[model samples]
Target: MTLGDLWKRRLNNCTKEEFFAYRRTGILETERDKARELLRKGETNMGLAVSRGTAKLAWLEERGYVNLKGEVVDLGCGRGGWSYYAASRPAVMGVKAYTIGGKGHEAPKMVTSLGWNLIKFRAGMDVFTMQPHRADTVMCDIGESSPDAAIEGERTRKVILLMEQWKNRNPSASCVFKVLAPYRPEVIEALHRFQLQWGGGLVRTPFSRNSTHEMYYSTAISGNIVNSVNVQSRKLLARFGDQRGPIRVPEMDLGVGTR
Candidate 1:
């Protein structure tokens, strides 16, 4: 279903007005005013976008695209909106997850209200680092940051982003970052450049209906990539074992990935 439908279905009579009212007067206090103004710009729009993003993520879960067992990280996990939804969604399949983002914000309270635990941090601080641990699936959703922010001429942004992500480079881990549209191609190209410069398997994900897609870049630093992929494949096979296969592909019993 659509984003609004999903929200309405889940919230069930919790109007947007009431949600915002609680956020402003209760959790956010004076910041409520600023938050409301921000909402006018794109916050509500972003909520719908996040819904689509998560829906796409659910689609991937249905496929064999990602191994959801490992830790999930959300950079700029504003109030744990997207992060919690992702993590919690996968919990049905038993994936453990964590989130890191701005502290003392009304958004985070929303997260806790959903029964999610969030990692709090200061803005303009290093997010990729200081997280609880390396994430198997990492996402950075920053509409405010330039699409080229990671590779832009900005010395600090460039250095920290490249150094930490590249140096730590979780081989069996996948990373997904959201960026603006103008530099989407450059960012895609840049990810390939990173794969070459750092040595890993990187795949660009596409969502035709959504402007933003989670570009997954993974490698085998902490675990074997092949093994991890197999783990995910096994899960899919278990679910869609009866799926049709080509003559060469064969059925379940053929000489292929684990019988």
Candidate 2:
């Protein structure tokens, strides 16, 4: 059968064994070991799933879930492999693409040659300030920096900015916020805040293979900045916010893949 047909069948037959097995050997071939190694090191991303070799992306295109020539974004975009894909999508021609690399994230320089913009490279850069309404899609793959660690108090500033910016400029705008499971309590709290503050948005786990990572899905309905607060003040609040028992987000526990 074709790749699209294969992806549909696999998606429907998402068994525990298949989940981990595909992750280990890769849904496609070539560089299979490299993908498995990355997972072992806790990379916490499906860059392989979204990369060139896979037919799954084509399947996404067939369903019209993700467009080719859409304005795309890669938040906390580490070396830009994902960003490159966004730029390469058929519908993304002449579109604006950017990467947000923070704190020791100098690797963005490694992907500049692939094309697309990679601004906001500072540790404390504000993503909301970029005016996200100009774009149609945004993706983030921010993973856990440490086991059980909460969102860094410092990073809250950017997170909040991102929420407020999207609320004010583009409601119903498609976006993705990837997070490590057992994500920092503050980040979860922020998601709740962003939803309520904006008054409307959808948040759900985009993908899970039992890897302890989750992505918050959001779509703005109106351009209205619901929450207003300075970065300094937000930082202070995050630092002093209450810490309850660890937040447990459900995820698929994919079995270990082959190396």
Candidate 3:
């Protein structure tokens, strides 16, 4: 059977064990070596799924959902791929990355070879335990495994709660997160409420693989500028006002009147 047909036929069967065993057989032996590469690329997202992958991250940044140019706190930085990508941006000021367990990843290694301010890499720490005390943007990409509704819901709620507090302190800050799907509708509602309360955006990224079924939600209080108190004072305000142009009241035919 062909690829699509094979999927249809596979659906005719059942049991988790058979599901994996069947796919492991892969495309027929007659298929070219490039077939294997393409198959894996389509399936695994060309090894980019470890993080949001560069394309997806670029998509996020281009839309301003997240800003990599400023201080960034990347959570669950698997293999440091996302962190490295953040640092690669020309405008990026710094990146503080954290990932739990083992160090042995190319992204992490490559990141250290550059100037330290570009990226600060750290591993072997839990997300709950190691939190970023400050940043201009807070980004989250947590571990994803087989579907667990309860656990996923709990994690989503807690992460949002944490980010909410951070946004409160940094009103003009921005944040982005990737959460597993199919997510709770309430989570989407909460995201909407957040943007309405502050400013935010929600999206199922265009580049996401159909198989993964994930969602990207982002929020930002952007474009805020502060000026000194005196600048707003009446004296300075009037000084900057249109003193050069003055208006004269027009006289009407009616002497007493409402002109």
Candidate 4:
């Protein structure tokens, strides 16, 4: 059978075991390991099945940006799963999670259950100003979108600028993001110009239909940026190369309102 047919067949036959197994060995395995390891160490991140928290952590580790003595910042941390997991790393200095607030956020529970070193800011703040704790690694999974294409483009540009500022302040800091798919050319260009090693590909979320997918990115100044790009590009190309359709830029509209 053809590759597409093979995936279709497997997906049709996939079971819970296959799903979790895929999570442990598929695109997210490395990330899942980091989260599972942290859970073993006593930190709690509710709903990891739906959160890319562990994958982001694993990406940081692979990039060599994570250190036992380093501090980590998780921005737009929707339930703070990433934050909680980061806080569990042994000998790690601390972790801070920033979010606007949600219906039943359990970040506080993590702080109480994990340790005082884990802090959560319920109020929203500008990514550009949400610093001062000193971060060895800065990561954000800023959700996608905008109502107006023009406005969305500008908004994305602003976030990219904020990322630039964060990297500037922490020159040695590693920046990772779960960006919208078909990344804007400008976004990719900015990352390339910064000389940050970065790469990621479209991957399916666990327990989701085969039609669903999301894009993730990881970057570091100390890592080989070109190599990361090549690796990620190869993956994307493999999946999309056969198609000769016109390339289109992904809409910045994540539908959550203004920045």
Model 4 per-residue lDDT at 223? 45
Candidate No. with top lDDT: 3
User: Comparing 2 and 3 by TM-score, which wins?
Assistant: 3
Candidate 2: what lDDT?
Answer: 0.40
Off by over 4 Å in 2: 1-69, 95-97, 100-106, 109-133, 152-161, 181-211, 216-259
Q: By TM-score, how accurate is candidate 3?
A: 0.59
lDDT digits (tens) for residues 1-259 of candidate 2: 3222233344345577544543322112233455445645656433343232123233343444443445565665554444545554545533333444443433442222222342233333445456565556655545543222233322543555564575466554556554332133455466566666544332222123222223333443322221311221232223222232222322211122211
lDDT of 1: 0.37
Writing each residue's lDDT as its tens digit, candidate 4 over 179-234 gives: 43223455446555654323322222322212222234445324443354344434
TM-score of each: 0.41, 0.44, 0.59, 0.53
> Tens digits of per-residue lDDT for model 1 on 36-110?
454445443222222224433443445554444445655555544445455454332222332343444423423
RMSD of each: 17.1, 15.0, 23.0, 11.7
lDDT score for candidate 4 against the true structure: 0.46
Off by over 4 Å in 1: 1-53, 59-64, 89-106, 109-125, 128-132, 143-169, 179-189, 197-259
| Highest TM-score scorer | 3
Better of 2 and 4 by TM-score: 4
lDDT of 3 by residue, 1-259 (tens): 2222222333334366544433322111121244234333544222222332445666677776676657888877765656656665666678888778655542343323122346677777676775347788778776363344445555666666666776776676667776553244444455556657667555545444322335566764232111111122222123221223222222111011110
